[PDB]
Amino acid sequence: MSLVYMNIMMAFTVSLTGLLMYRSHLMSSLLCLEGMMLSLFILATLMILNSHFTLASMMPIILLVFAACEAALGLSLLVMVSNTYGTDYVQNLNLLQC
Amino acid sequence: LQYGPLAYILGEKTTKKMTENSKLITVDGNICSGKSKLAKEVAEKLGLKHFPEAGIHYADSTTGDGKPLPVRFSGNCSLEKFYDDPKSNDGNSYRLQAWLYASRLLQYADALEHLLSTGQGVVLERSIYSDFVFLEAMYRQGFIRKQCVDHYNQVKKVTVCEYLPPHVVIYVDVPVSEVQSRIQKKGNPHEMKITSAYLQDIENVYKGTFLPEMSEKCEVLQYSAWEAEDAEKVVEDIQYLKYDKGPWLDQDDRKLHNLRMLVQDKLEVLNYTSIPVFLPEVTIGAHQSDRVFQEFTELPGRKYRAGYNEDVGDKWIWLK
Amino acid sequence: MMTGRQARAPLQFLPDEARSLPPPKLTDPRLAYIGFLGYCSGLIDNAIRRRPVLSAGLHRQFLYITSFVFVGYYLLKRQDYMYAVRDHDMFSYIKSHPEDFPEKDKKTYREVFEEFHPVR
Amino acid sequence: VAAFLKNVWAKEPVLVASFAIAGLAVILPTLSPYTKYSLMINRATPYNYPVPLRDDGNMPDVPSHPQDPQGPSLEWLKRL
Amino acid sequence: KFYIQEPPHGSPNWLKVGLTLGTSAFLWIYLIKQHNEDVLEYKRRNGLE
Amino acid sequence: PFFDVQKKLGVDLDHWMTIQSAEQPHRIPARCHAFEKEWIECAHGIGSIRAE
Amino acid sequence: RDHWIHVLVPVGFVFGYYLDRKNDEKLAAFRNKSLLYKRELKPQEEVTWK
């Protein structure tokens, strides 16, 4: 397919691979997840402006707002983890092995 | 139930009945500290509902006809046999202690349920917060094993964390000499077999373990053998306290609604007393449990739910 | 499969054409079995709350039976409607494509040769 | 309902001003006569091209020139 | 009396029992009316009279 | 489970943003208004299998 | 009845037996139509089997 869309998809898959190989922190997971959301915003915006499809121009803002609210929820979860262990480490989140 | 979340929606808020007299006061002391009169005296000065000390047959007194059941259905343990042989083979020591912990847990649930359904305070005698002080004093006498202390600490860790501490802990200082004097003057032939060092270890776990950890979570009031005789000085100490510690202060309608829904469900209160941690003093096999249960079902009033027993005179059953 | 049929008139539990079909009788064995399920739910409800199972809550067992029969009557109407729609669409598609459904020439066994396999 | 109003105007005049302004912002667009003119001005603002119609023969309400009598006129907007 | 505490089901809840019998009788009479209207509609659409 | 409530009750909750050829603000055309209109008018009502 | 339980199984037989007869009138599609047992009806006879 097209070229700049392939670049935005490449960024989406790169932040996906960063979202699928955890190093140390939960904040790194939330950052890779919101980089994915950013690339979804960029690619949706370029499609909607390309076709001159007018009513969908409110769609990326919608795609922003919900997902930003989603990120807020994720941040609050991280905080409660960091109120139990002192760190946001993903290896402290292993009590559900049994 | 009668109280539920819909009653909380329709306006039955349990801080509306929380007044300054709504206090849960636990009177603590040694075996014959003579506090059993004092607590009743507080019940006729502060206007509080006295709950007696939970014996073997507390749950028998709360349910059914209110009479004590035979010992095979309730307890399977005797206080007087613990007075005779504390180092017995079959393990009456930890079995009697665990049944008393469950009975005091039902007493404390009834105490909080009365306090949250009426707004009238409750005077308790030796609540669940002051029960391990016998267990430790049993384990210091070799009457039980370490695995019994582990089982009790498991049950306490999963049961006492759901509740609030009492408002006032009234402790009575009576030394071992006057305790033995009142035991020998009491006249119970089984109770006089209590040794000296057992009472000493009760008083040691009282003074060194119970009261210092109760000092942070509530306010204790400590009395000797003779100044606890006057009820008016005790009531003047209670009323002129300034309640400033403990988790009772950050209690809104939501936390107290959760606690009141917790304590009215008696099987959820008594849930973790019978955890499947297999200890030989409390483990009953399948044949004995089956036989005792089928003998329990044929008791009068115990065959069905309480409003549904034709043998004790329940009418309108076919419309209930 | 038949979701194109319920796409020009959505969310109709019983269409108007379902009224052209006979309803289930009130002595339907399926409906009496659903009433038996209501009686079983009443007995289990009086059993799990430790009530006298046959005696207690006869109004409650009567409402269990009545509620299961009431829902099951309409479920049987919708079942009969959906199998009637299935056969109606089948017969219309058979009638509208004779070239895909030829009449097979039925041969008698005096012409049909079967290889005999002896059993011994 | 009046002593409570004086009490809340004494204690918390900010919230009284906020609820009063919000209540007026809700009710007053319907109690107004000039609200319909907002609708009329926004539907008479020509963002597009007024695409003409083929004259079939019988259309009395459609003009042939902008300086004709028939057609939607904005005398009310010029005058008000 | 026999019980030391009053049970929640010592007496029949007459509002609940009355609503139970009334709702069940309503479902029966509405079911019978629906079945009679359906057999009348079937005989009117298919001509079995 | 596609409970088509919008066709049962007769409400337009999200049909307007669905295609490009719908009623746009100030009659703005999309870039492919004619092509999408012809694909929709071709493939209308005949089902997906015949429409492909 | 003093022994009312002792007719759960016999009467439960009879009704069951009854239902078999009730099914046979629904399997009467070839009554007096088989190529083997077909015949003309006798006087005072309306069906061959019931």
Place this chain on the structure above:
Amino acid sequence: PLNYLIGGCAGGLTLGIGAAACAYMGLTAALVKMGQLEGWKVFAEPKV
């Protein structure tokens, strides 16, 4: 079928446990051979 049964048992002898893997891989390769013969579909196309 018998040759791929021999091949499955040959793959099972280099797997170890020995005779069980012999029989399992032999029966599995037998099913592969019979699927190649009679046209057995594992991911069958939806047809009706």
Place this chain on the structure above:
Amino acid sequence: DAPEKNYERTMAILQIESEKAELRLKELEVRRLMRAKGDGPWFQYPTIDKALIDHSPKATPDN
């Protein structure tokens, strides 16, 4: 029961079940043809309703 009744009842049973078996084979064949060609009332997966398209004159003429 009589051999007449059993014989003719067996013939009715065989009629009903042979008719159901013929209809089940027709059910399989009808489903196969309707999935394969898509011209029957079944397998009608939805397309875009053409009642959504605007037909008013737009801003630019070329569309």
Place this chain on the structure above:
Amino acid sequence: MNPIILIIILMTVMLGTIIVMISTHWLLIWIGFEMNMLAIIPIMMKKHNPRATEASTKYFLTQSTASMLLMMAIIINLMFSGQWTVMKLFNPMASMLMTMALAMKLGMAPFHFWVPEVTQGIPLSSGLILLTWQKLAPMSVLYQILPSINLDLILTLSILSITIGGWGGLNQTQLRKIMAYSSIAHMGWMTAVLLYNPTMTLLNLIIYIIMTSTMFTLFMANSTTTTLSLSHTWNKAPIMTILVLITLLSMGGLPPLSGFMPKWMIIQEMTKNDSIILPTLMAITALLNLYFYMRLTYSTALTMFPSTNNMKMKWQFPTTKRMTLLPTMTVLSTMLLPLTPILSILE
């Protein structure tokens, strides 16, 4: 939790699933999944302990990854189709992404690695919601996009889900993880028959929700979370003892019970379409589910009985718990098989 806030949050969960069910637009599908997740996060944290925060964190990460993959599939559909109708997808790349994302939202293997954890971390009613109500929206989207779902991918995910939900039930004493692996196996069963007859998908879904709701309602009535804690049911409430186990004999898939109703019908739709090997393998793995769950049945109705003495006190108190629809759901999860042709109502 404030009960008005609980009612509002539960209606928001139901509203998010309804918005996924009724919408003709992809943005509203995504909005309904976002609303459903956002509202169900406090349901898991009803008790405020660290295991619920860990469970909610794992659930947030998996469902957020699935939501972003769903939006990427929607965006690629808008590339190759220029439109937004919830219908078949017009790119097999977008089809593969939406199939993977809905398998993540259902917890189908190999995206199953969050289902036994989160169900372990949360209470029994929230696990009931997670294993009954949260299946309804992605199965609805799979119902609406099946002309684009790849056959080989959905069959791979189906049989891998059935095998891993089978071999997950061996080593477990936790009732909630056993319900989670039973969830994974049944989602493999539902998506096995999706491209052949989705009416049997809805039948399997309804029978699964009825059996799972009966089992979680029994677990809430007895307040038992482990096998060893379930083993004391015979002495406390003996009527509770067998109903769990005839419901679990149903959940294995076993005649004449109604849990034999889905799987048989699934086989009945896959031997039509000339697949004989695949339902054979899947239902042999269902017999492996019977193997482990029958071992649990032996655990409760038989050998490992013995009681403790405090149980004698529980004899003097009935269950005041709301066992809501539990006789109805227990009758509907066993004795429904003679009404098996009721399934035509799900067309």
